[PDB]
Amino acid sequence: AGPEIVKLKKILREKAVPPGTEVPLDVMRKGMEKVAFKAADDIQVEQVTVAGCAAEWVRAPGCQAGKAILYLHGGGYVMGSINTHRSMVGEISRASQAAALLLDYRLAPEHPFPAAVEDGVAAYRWLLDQGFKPQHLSISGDSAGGGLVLAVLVSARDQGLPMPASAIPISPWADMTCTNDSFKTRAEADPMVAPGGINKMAARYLNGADAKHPYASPNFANLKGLPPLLIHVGRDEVLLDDSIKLDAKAKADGVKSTLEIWDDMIHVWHAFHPMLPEGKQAIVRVGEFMREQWAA
């Protein structure tokens, strides 16, 4: 365990709201906005609207034209924005030498499931209509967003849309039931995800829907036909099992899956690239995989 992660964890426990205090939604939304890292200043951005949603093209230096990433931000389906994730995605644009489409998709409780999936699907269609070829596209996302990646692939496949070349769920939340062993097993090492907190998110997102609906919980979906997967998860997360079981569902279903559990790492440790060498290296690796998959 590197000095940085030990140090990062301490800072995160030191900053945390105590277990089971109820922070109002707009207070968590604002809080996530003010603590967001600034994107590197060589990251260029262009505002666009896509299927009725604000979005940014986020382009590091080195981007190949013709290539793109549909990116789906985490935030539990209830928070997050172009602004919270502009930084990390900037770096995924850097490492993959592809511009990223960063979608500000509809959030719960104002727009419950399946609103975010419709937005992801429509943003994918949009990319195909701009004339990006499927073989030149990738879909990536973190946390809730990594679940959405899968839900988007499934829903798009059901609708006859072709699959993109690769998909990269980062710390995906792929099972709304939150029943997995790692909610107990990895709970002390996870400075990052309380439940009750994660359960309220689900409740606000599903708003009465089946928690085992394939598009809400793709760990229950039929994954057959999806393109190659890189799944990143941290060993020190409450969501370990979502990612182990995802990789198993995918393998069972015919999908080329590569799951990497990065020891000592926390939820979306990528987001902490500025101060965390592993955050940086994991991002380099998402980039490398998108590019391997495109060179194939």
CSV table of C-alpha atoms in Angstrom, one decimal:
chain,number,residue,atom,x,y,z
A,1,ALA,CA,0.0,0.0,0.0
A,2,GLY,CA,1.5,3.3,-1.2
A,3,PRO,CA,1.9,6.3,1.1
A,4,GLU,CA,-0.7,8.2,-0.9
A,5,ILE,CA,-3.6,5.8,-0.5
A,6,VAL,CA,-3.0,5.5,3.2
A,7,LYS,CA,-2.9,9.3,3.3
A,8,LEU,CA,-5.8,9.8,1.0
A,9,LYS,CA,-7.9,7.4,3.2
A,10,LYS,CA,-7.1,9.3,6.3
A,11,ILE,CA,-8.1,12.6,4.7
A,12,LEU,CA,-11.4,11.0,3.5
A,13,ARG,CA,-12.3,9.6,7.0
A,14,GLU,CA,-11.3,12.9,8.5
A,15,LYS,CA,-13.6,14.8,6.1
A,16,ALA,CA,-16.6,12.4,6.2
A,17,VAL,CA,-20.0,13.0,7.5
A,18,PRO,CA,-20.5,10.6,10.5
A,19,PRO,CA,-22.3,7.2,9.7
A,20,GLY,CA,-26.0,7.6,9.3
A,21,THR,CA,-26.4,11.3,9.3
A,22,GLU,CA,-29.0,12.2,6.6
A,23,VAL,CA,-27.6,14.9,4.3
A,24,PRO,CA,-30.4,16.5,2.2
A,25,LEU,CA,-30.1,15.9,-1.5
A,26,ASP,CA,-29.4,19.4,-2.7
A,27,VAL,CA,-26.7,19.7,0.1
A,28,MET,CA,-24.9,16.5,-1.3
A,29,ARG,CA,-25.3,17.9,-4.9
A,30,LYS,CA,-23.7,21.2,-4.0
A,31,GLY,CA,-21.1,19.6,-1.9
A,32,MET,CA,-20.0,17.3,-4.8
A,33,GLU,CA,-19.9,20.4,-7.1
A,34,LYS,CA,-17.7,22.6,-4.8
A,35,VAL,CA,-15.2,19.8,-4.1
A,36,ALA,CA,-14.8,18.8,-7.7
A,37,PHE,CA,-11.3,18.9,-9.2
A,38,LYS,CA,-10.6,21.4,-12.0
A,39,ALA,CA,-9.8,19.8,-15.3
A,40,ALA,CA,-6.1,20.2,-16.6
A,41,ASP,CA,-5.9,23.4,-18.5
A,42,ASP,CA,-4.9,21.7,-21.7
A,43,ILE,CA,-8.3,20.0,-21.8
A,44,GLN,CA,-10.5,21.7,-24.3
A,45,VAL,CA,-14.2,21.6,-23.9
A,46,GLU,CA,-17.3,22.3,-26.3
A,47,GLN,CA,-20.9,22.5,-25.0
A,48,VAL,CA,-23.4,20.7,-27.0
A,49,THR,CA,-26.9,19.3,-26.5
A,50,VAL,CA,-27.5,15.6,-27.2
A,51,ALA,CA,-31.0,14.0,-27.1
A,52,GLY,CA,-32.3,16.9,-25.0
A,53,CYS,CA,-29.5,17.0,-22.4
A,54,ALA,CA,-26.6,19.4,-21.9
A,55,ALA,CA,-23.3,17.7,-22.7
A,56,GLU,CA,-19.6,18.5,-23.3
A,57,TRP,CA,-17.2,17.2,-25.8
A,58,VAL,CA,-14.1,16.9,-23.7
A,59,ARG,CA,-10.9,16.7,-25.7
A,60,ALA,CA,-7.4,16.2,-24.2
A,61,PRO,CA,-4.3,16.8,-26.5
A,62,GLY,CA,-3.7,13.9,-28.9
A,63,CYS,CA,-7.3,13.0,-29.9
A,64,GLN,CA,-7.8,11.0,-33.1
A,65,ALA,CA,-10.8,12.4,-35.1
A,66,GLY,CA,-13.4,9.7,-35.8
A,67,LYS,CA,-13.0,8.2,-32.4
A,68,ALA,CA,-15.3,8.9,-29.3
A,69,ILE,CA,-16.3,7.8,-25.7
A,70,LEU,CA,-19.8,8.1,-24.5
A,71,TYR,CA,-19.1,8.8,-20.8
A,72,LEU,CA,-21.6,8.2,-18.0
A,73,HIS,CA,-20.8,9.9,-14.7
A,74,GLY,CA,-21.3,8.4,-11.2
A,75,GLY,CA,-23.3,10.1,-8.5
A,76,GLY,CA,-25.8,7.3,-7.6
A,77,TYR,CA,-28.3,8.3,-10.3
A,78,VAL,CA,-29.1,11.3,-8.1
A,79,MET,CA,-26.1,13.6,-8.2
A,80,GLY,CA,-23.0,14.3,-10.4
A,81,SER,CA,-22.7,16.5,-13.5
A,82,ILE,CA,-20.5,17.5,-16.3
A,83,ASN,CA,-18.6,19.7,-13.8
A,84,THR,CA,-18.0,16.9,-11.2
A,85,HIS,CA,-16.5,14.5,-13.7
A,86,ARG,CA,-14.8,16.9,-16.3
A,87,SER,CA,-11.4,16.3,-14.7
A,88,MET,CA,-11.2,12.5,-14.6
A,89,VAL,CA,-12.7,12.2,-18.1
A,90,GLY,CA,-10.3,14.7,-19.4
A,91,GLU,CA,-7.6,12.3,-18.4
A,92,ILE,CA,-9.4,9.3,-20.0
A,93,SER,CA,-9.5,11.4,-23.1
A,94,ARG,CA,-5.8,11.9,-22.7
A,95,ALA,CA,-4.8,8.2,-22.2
A,96,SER,CA,-7.2,6.9,-24.9
A,97,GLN,CA,-6.5,9.7,-27.4
A,98,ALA,CA,-10.2,9.8,-28.0
A,99,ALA,CA,-12.5,12.8,-27.4
A,100,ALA,CA,-15.2,12.0,-24.7
A,101,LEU,CA,-18.9,12.9,-24.9
A,102,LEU,CA,-19.7,13.7,-21.2
A,103,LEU,CA,-23.5,13.6,-20.8
A,104,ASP,CA,-25.5,15.5,-18.2
A,105,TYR,CA,-28.3,12.7,-18.2
A,106,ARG,CA,-31.5,13.1,-16.3
A,107,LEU,CA,-31.2,12.5,-12.5
A,108,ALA,CA,-33.5,11.0,-9.8
A,109,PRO,CA,-35.7,11.8,-7.9
A,110,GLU,CA,-37.0,14.3,-10.5
A,111,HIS,CA,-36.5,11.8,-13.4
A,112,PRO,CA,-36.5,8.2,-12.0
A,113,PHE,CA,-35.5,5.1,-13.7
A,114,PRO,CA,-35.6,4.4,-16.6
A,115,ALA,CA,-34.8,8.0,-17.5
A,116,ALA,CA,-31.0,7.8,-17.3
A,117,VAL,CA,-31.0,4.7,-19.6
A,118,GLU,CA,-33.2,6.5,-22.2
A,119,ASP,CA,-30.7,9.3,-22.1
A,120,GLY,CA,-27.7,7.0,-22.5
A,121,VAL,CA,-29.3,5.0,-25.3
A,122,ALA,CA,-30.3,8.2,-27.1
A,123,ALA,CA,-26.8,9.7,-26.7
A,124,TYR,CA,-25.4,6.5,-28.2
A,125,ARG,CA,-27.9,6.7,-31.2
A,126,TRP,CA,-26.9,10.4,-31.5
A,127,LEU,CA,-23.2,9.4,-31.9
A,128,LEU,CA,-24.1,6.9,-34.6
A,129,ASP,CA,-26.2,9.6,-36.4
A,130,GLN,CA,-23.2,12.0,-36.3
A,131,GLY,CA,-21.5,9.2,-38.3
A,132,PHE,CA,-19.1,7.8,-35.7
A,133,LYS,CA,-18.8,4.1,-36.6
A,134,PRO,CA,-19.6,1.6,-33.8
A,135,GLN,CA,-16.1,0.2,-34.2
A,136,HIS,CA,-14.7,3.7,-33.4
A,137,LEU,CA,-16.8,4.1,-30.3
A,138,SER,CA,-16.5,3.1,-26.6
A,139,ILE,CA,-18.8,3.5,-23.5
A,140,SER,CA,-17.3,4.1,-20.1
A,141,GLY,CA,-18.7,5.2,-16.6
A,142,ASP,CA,-18.1,5.1,-12.9
A,143,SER,CA,-20.1,3.9,-10.0
A,144,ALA,CA,-23.8,4.3,-10.9
A,145,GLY,CA,-22.5,5.4,-14.2
A,146,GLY,CA,-20.7,2.1,-14.7
A,147,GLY,CA,-24.0,0.3,-14.0
A,148,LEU,CA,-25.6,2.6,-16.6
A,149,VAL,CA,-22.8,1.7,-19.1
A,150,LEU,CA,-24.1,-1.9,-19.0
A,151,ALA,CA,-27.8,-0.9,-18.9
A,152,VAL,CA,-27.2,1.2,-22.0
A,153,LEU,CA,-25.5,-1.7,-23.8
A,154,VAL,CA,-28.3,-4.1,-23.0
A,155,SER,CA,-31.1,-1.7,-23.8
A,156,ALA,CA,-29.3,-0.6,-27.1
A,157,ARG,CA,-28.8,-4.3,-28.1
A,158,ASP,CA,-32.5,-5.1,-27.4
A,159,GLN,CA,-33.4,-2.2,-29.7
A,160,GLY,CA,-31.2,-3.4,-32.7
A,161,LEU,CA,-28.4,-0.8,-32.2
A,162,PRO,CA,-24.9,-2.1,-33.0
A,163,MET,CA,-22.5,-2.6,-30.1
A,164,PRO,CA,-19.4,-0.3,-29.8
A,165,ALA,CA,-15.8,-1.7,-29.8
A,166,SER,CA,-15.4,-1.7,-26.0
A,167,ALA,CA,-17.0,-0.9,-22.7
A,168,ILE,CA,-15.3,0.2,-19.5
A,169,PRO,CA,-17.2,0.1,-16.2
A,170,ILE,CA,-15.3,1.8,-13.4
A,171,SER,CA,-16.4,0.6,-9.9
A,172,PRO,CA,-19.8,-0.2,-11.5
A,173,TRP,CA,-22.9,-0.3,-9.3
A,174,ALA,CA,-24.6,-3.1,-11.1
A,175,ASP,CA,-27.2,-4.5,-8.5
A,176,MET,CA,-29.7,-2.2,-6.8
A,177,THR,CA,-30.5,-4.8,-4.1
A,178,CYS,CA,-27.2,-4.1,-2.3
A,179,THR,CA,-27.2,-7.6,-0.8
A,180,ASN,CA,-23.7,-8.7,-1.8
A,181,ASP,CA,-21.3,-10.1,0.8
A,182,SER,CA,-18.9,-7.2,0.3
A,183,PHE,CA,-21.3,-4.8,1.9
A,184,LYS,CA,-20.2,-6.5,5.1
A,185,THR,CA,-16.9,-8.0,4.1
A,186,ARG,CA,-15.2,-4.8,2.7
A,187,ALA,CA,-17.1,-2.3,4.9
A,188,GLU,CA,-14.3,-1.3,7.3
A,189,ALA,CA,-11.8,-0.7,4.4
A,190,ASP,CA,-14.2,1.4,2.3
A,191,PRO,CA,-13.9,5.1,3.4
A,192,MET,CA,-16.1,6.1,0.5
A,193,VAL,CA,-19.6,4.4,0.5
A,194,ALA,CA,-21.9,4.1,3.5
A,195,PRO,CA,-25.1,2.2,3.0
A,196,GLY,CA,-28.4,3.6,4.0
A,197,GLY,CA,-26.7,6.2,1.8
A,198,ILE,CA,-26.5,3.8,-1.1
A,199,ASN,CA,-29.9,2.4,-0.3
A,200,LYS,CA,-31.6,5.8,-0.4
A,201,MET,CA,-30.1,6.4,-3.8
A,202,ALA,CA,-31.6,3.1,-5.1
A,203,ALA,CA,-34.9,4.0,-3.5
A,204,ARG,CA,-34.9,7.5,-5.2
A,205,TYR,CA,-33.9,6.0,-8.5
A,206,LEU,CA,-36.2,3.0,-8.7
A,207,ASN,CA,-39.1,4.9,-7.3
A,208,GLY,CA,-41.1,1.6,-7.0
A,209,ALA,CA,-39.5,-0.2,-10.0
A,210,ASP,CA,-38.2,-3.9,-9.7
A,211,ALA,CA,-34.7,-3.6,-8.2
A,212,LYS,CA,-33.9,-6.7,-10.4
A,213,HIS,CA,-35.0,-5.0,-13.6
A,214,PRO,CA,-32.1,-5.7,-16.1
A,215,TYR,CA,-31.8,-2.0,-17.0
A,216,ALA,CA,-31.5,-0.9,-13.4
A,217,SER,CA,-29.4,-3.9,-12.2
A,218,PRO,CA,-27.5,-5.3,-15.2
A,219,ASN,CA,-26.0,-8.0,-12.9
A,220,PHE,CA,-29.4,-9.6,-13.6
A,221,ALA,CA,-29.4,-8.8,-17.4
A,222,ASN,CA,-28.7,-10.9,-20.3
A,223,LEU,CA,-25.3,-9.8,-21.4
A,224,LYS,CA,-25.0,-11.9,-24.6
A,225,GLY,CA,-23.6,-10.0,-27.5
A,226,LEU,CA,-21.9,-7.2,-25.7
A,227,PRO,CA,-18.4,-6.1,-26.8
A,228,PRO,CA,-15.2,-6.6,-24.8
A,229,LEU,CA,-15.2,-5.3,-21.2
A,230,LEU,CA,-12.6,-3.8,-19.0
A,231,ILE,CA,-14.0,-3.8,-15.4
A,232,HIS,CA,-12.0,-1.8,-12.8
A,233,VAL,CA,-12.9,-2.1,-9.1
A,234,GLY,CA,-11.0,-1.6,-5.9
A,235,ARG,CA,-10.3,-4.3,-3.5
A,236,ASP,CA,-11.3,-1.9,-0.6
A,237,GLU,CA,-14.8,-1.3,-1.7
A,238,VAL,CA,-18.2,-2.3,-0.7
A,239,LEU,CA,-18.9,-2.8,-4.4
A,240,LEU,CA,-16.3,-5.5,-4.9
A,241,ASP,CA,-18.9,-8.2,-5.4
A,242,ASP,CA,-20.9,-6.3,-8.0
A,243,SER,CA,-17.8,-6.4,-10.2
A,244,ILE,CA,-16.8,-10.0,-9.4
A,245,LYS,CA,-20.4,-11.2,-10.2
A,246,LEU,CA,-20.6,-8.9,-13.3
A,247,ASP,CA,-17.4,-10.5,-14.7
A,248,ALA,CA,-18.8,-14.0,-14.0
A,249,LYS,CA,-22.3,-13.1,-15.7
A,250,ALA,CA,-20.4,-11.7,-18.7
A,251,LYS,CA,-18.0,-14.7,-19.1
A,252,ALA,CA,-21.1,-17.0,-18.7
A,253,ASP,CA,-22.9,-15.0,-21.3
A,254,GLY,CA,-20.2,-15.2,-24.0
A,255,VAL,CA,-18.7,-11.7,-23.3
A,256,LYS,CA,-14.8,-11.1,-23.3
A,257,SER,CA,-14.4,-9.8,-19.9
A,258,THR,CA,-11.2,-8.7,-18.1
A,259,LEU,CA,-11.7,-7.8,-14.5
A,260,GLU,CA,-8.9,-6.1,-12.6
A,261,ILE,CA,-9.2,-5.8,-8.8
A,262,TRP,CA,-6.6,-3.3,-7.8
A,263,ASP,CA,-5.4,-4.0,-4.3
A,264,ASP,CA,-5.8,-1.3,-1.6
A,265,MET,CA,-7.9,0.9,-3.9
A,266,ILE,CA,-11.1,2.6,-3.1
A,267,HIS,CA,-14.3,3.5,-5.0
A,268,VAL,CA,-13.5,5.2,-8.4
A,269,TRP,CA,-9.9,5.8,-7.1
A,270,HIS,CA,-9.4,7.2,-10.6
A,271,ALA,CA,-11.1,10.4,-9.5
A,272,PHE,CA,-8.1,11.1,-7.3
A,273,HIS,CA,-5.5,11.0,-10.1
A,274,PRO,CA,-4.0,14.4,-9.2
A,275,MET,CA,-2.6,13.1,-5.9
A,276,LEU,CA,-2.8,9.3,-6.4
A,277,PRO,CA,-0.2,7.4,-8.6
A,278,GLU,CA,-2.6,4.4,-8.9
A,279,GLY,CA,-5.5,6.8,-10.0
A,280,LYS,CA,-3.2,8.0,-12.7
A,281,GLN,CA,-2.1,4.4,-13.8
A,282,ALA,CA,-5.6,3.0,-13.8
A,283,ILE,CA,-6.7,5.8,-16.1
A,284,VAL,CA,-3.6,5.1,-18.3
A,285,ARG,CA,-4.9,1.5,-18.4
A,286,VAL,CA,-8.5,2.4,-19.4
A,287,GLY,CA,-7.0,4.4,-22.3
A,288,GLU,CA,-4.7,1.5,-23.3
A,289,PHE,CA,-7.7,-1.0,-23.4
A,290,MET,CA,-9.9,1.3,-25.5
A,291,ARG,CA,-7.0,1.6,-27.9
A,292,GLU,CA,-6.1,-2.1,-27.9
A,293,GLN,CA,-9.8,-2.7,-28.7
A,294,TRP,CA,-9.8,-0.2,-31.5
A,295,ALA,CA,-6.5,-1.5,-33.0
A,296,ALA,CA,-8.1,-5.0,-33.1
